[PDB]
Paper text:
Helicase E5 is a multi-domain protein; its primer synthesis and DNA unwinding activity are required for genome uncoating and DNA replication of MPXV. MPXV E5 is encoded by the E5R gene, the mature protein is 785 amino acids (aa) in length. MPXV E5 can be divided into 6 domains: the AEP domain, the ZnD domain (Zinc-binding domain), the D5N domain (a domain associated with D5-type helicases), the Linker, the SF3 Helicase domain, and the C-Tail. MPXV E5 belongs to the SF3 helicase superfamily, which normally forms hexamer and unwinds DNA with 3′- to 5′ polarity.
Residue numbers in the entry: 2 to 224
């Protein structure tokens, strides 16, 4: 669609708690904008880095991929994890598609198809928990739409018997929100990272602000 442009510049914060003025003035001690190949190189050259992806100017442009931060503070047997991931995709796509259909004028079947057909999953290396980020690579909305969906997702987490669905962290749907970049640390005191998982090997597949639509992409927003 002519009214939808993409984004290939990834804005990252370099620590937790970056002051708003430093985001706005782009103080390089705190923030930097990268193309994906430059971001990969920065990570390789700064192995202590703690990077957090965020929208550079959400008032001007706020198209994002649907993403979830799943924070289960428990171990799962491998078979239970695999079954739960499959069920999670069904439950979450059904819930987003219903919301998109009723609140966004969306084509329900296109939300279902786009979300189920292409998503990336990280895995936290902390084996005492079941923590991951999921990005629906081909399902796009605006951040304000995700904020409007926050309570619907909260209610889904409270009604589900799936331990992963119950662990969706809905606090991430907010202005100036961040998602820690795959492969990087949270703080200088914790060495655990999220790793990529097959079949997605490219960093752009793990970024919620990277927008490169094609005919498989589906976009919806509040209407
Ligand atoms: Mg998390
Ligand atoms: Mg969280």
């Amino acid at each position: 669609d002519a009214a939808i442009r993409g984004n290939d510049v990834i804005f990252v914060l370099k620590t937790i708690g970056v002051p708003s003025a430093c985001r706005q003035n782009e103080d390089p001690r705190f923030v930097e904008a990268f193309k994906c190949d430059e971001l990969e190189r920065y990570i390789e050259n700064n192995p202590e880095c703690t990077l957090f992806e965020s929208l550079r100017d959400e008032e001007a442009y706020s198209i994002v991929r649907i993403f979830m931060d799943v924070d289960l503070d428990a171990c799962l047997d491998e078979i239970d994890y695999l079954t739960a991931i499959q069920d999670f995709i069904i439950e979450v796509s059904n819930c987003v598609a219903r919301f998109a259909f009723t609140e966004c004028g969306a084509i329900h079947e296109n939300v279902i198809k786009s979300m189920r057909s292409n998503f990336s999953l990280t895995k936290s290396t902390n084996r005492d928990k079941t923590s991951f980020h999921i990005i629906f690579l081909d399902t796009y909305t605006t951040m304000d739409t995700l904020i409007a969906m926050k309570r619907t997702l909260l209610e889904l987490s409270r009604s589900s018997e799936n331990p992963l669905t119950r662990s969706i962290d809905t606090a991430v749907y907010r202005r100036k929100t961040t998602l820690r970049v795959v492969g990087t640390r949270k703080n200088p005191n914790c060495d655990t990272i999220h790793v990529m998982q097959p079949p997605h090997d490219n960093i752009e597949d793990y970024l919620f602000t990277y927008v490169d639509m094609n005919n498989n992409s589906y976009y919806f927003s509040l209407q």
